[PDB]
Design a protein around this nucleic acid. Structure first.
Length: 159
DNA sequence: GGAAGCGAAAGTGTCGCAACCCGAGAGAGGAACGATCTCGGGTTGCGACACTTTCGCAACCCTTAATACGTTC
């Protein structure tokens, strides 16, 4: 994982895998993406995702034999009844990308601390970094923070 | 992958007990030996458990890394 060439080589080695599974999923109206070793499948049709794990095992055996295997402990089904996240990003029930309630509450906590000059420099730097990420995933959250905390405070923070 | 120490799992050998067999011996019945019962020593089968052997957890991070803050693998 630590080598600069490893990302490229790993993506290449998964090329044929991705081709086959993507095509197969598209026929049954399943969305498929891969982030390195993390595979994600989603659908609006009930009772279609149950077949996917078996399909995966067969394909892996076909392409790689016993070299690459599913982590069966890490196979998880979810729905709008439950928490859904993809690579650290929460998908809320309004179908919008979110940081999640707990992370948002934590950020608000840090901003409140800053407002009263209680954040140390390390925490301040941390807060600034996290807000940049928040701006990328959920820009509306930043707008809300501006409304809640004065634009002036927030600008002062981000300056 | 697998140090060093440790113990799980599983197979093998030991060993002490119980049940049995055998001959020896004192001497009931009544008056001639020797009935019945117990001593002492040996054998054999059984099974609980001690002993033996193998496996596998995961220290270390190899000379060889970078340093603005966050996120993901």
């Amino acid at each position: 994982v630590g080598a600069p060439s490893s990302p490229v080589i790993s993506n290449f080695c998964m090329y044929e895998f991705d081709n086959r599974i993507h095509a197969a999923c598209k026929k049954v109206e399943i969305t498929y993406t891969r982030y390195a070793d993390d595979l994600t499948f989603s659908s609006n049709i009930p009772d279609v995702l149950k077949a996917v794990p078996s399909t995966l095992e067969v394909l892996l055996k076909d392409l790689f034999g016993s070299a690459l295997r599913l982590n069966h402990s890490k196979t998880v089904f979810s729905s709008k009844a439950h928490n859904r996240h993809v690579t650290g990003i929460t998908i809320n029930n309004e179908e919008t990308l979110s940081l999640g309630r707990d992370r948002k509450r934590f950020i608000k906590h840090l901003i409140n601390q800053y407002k009263y000059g209680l954040l140390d420099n390390e925490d301040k730097a941390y807060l600034i970094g996290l807000l940049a990420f928040a701006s990328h995933i959920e820009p509306s959250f930043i707008t809300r923070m501006n409304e809640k905390y004065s634009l002036e405070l927030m600008e002062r923070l981000r300056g």
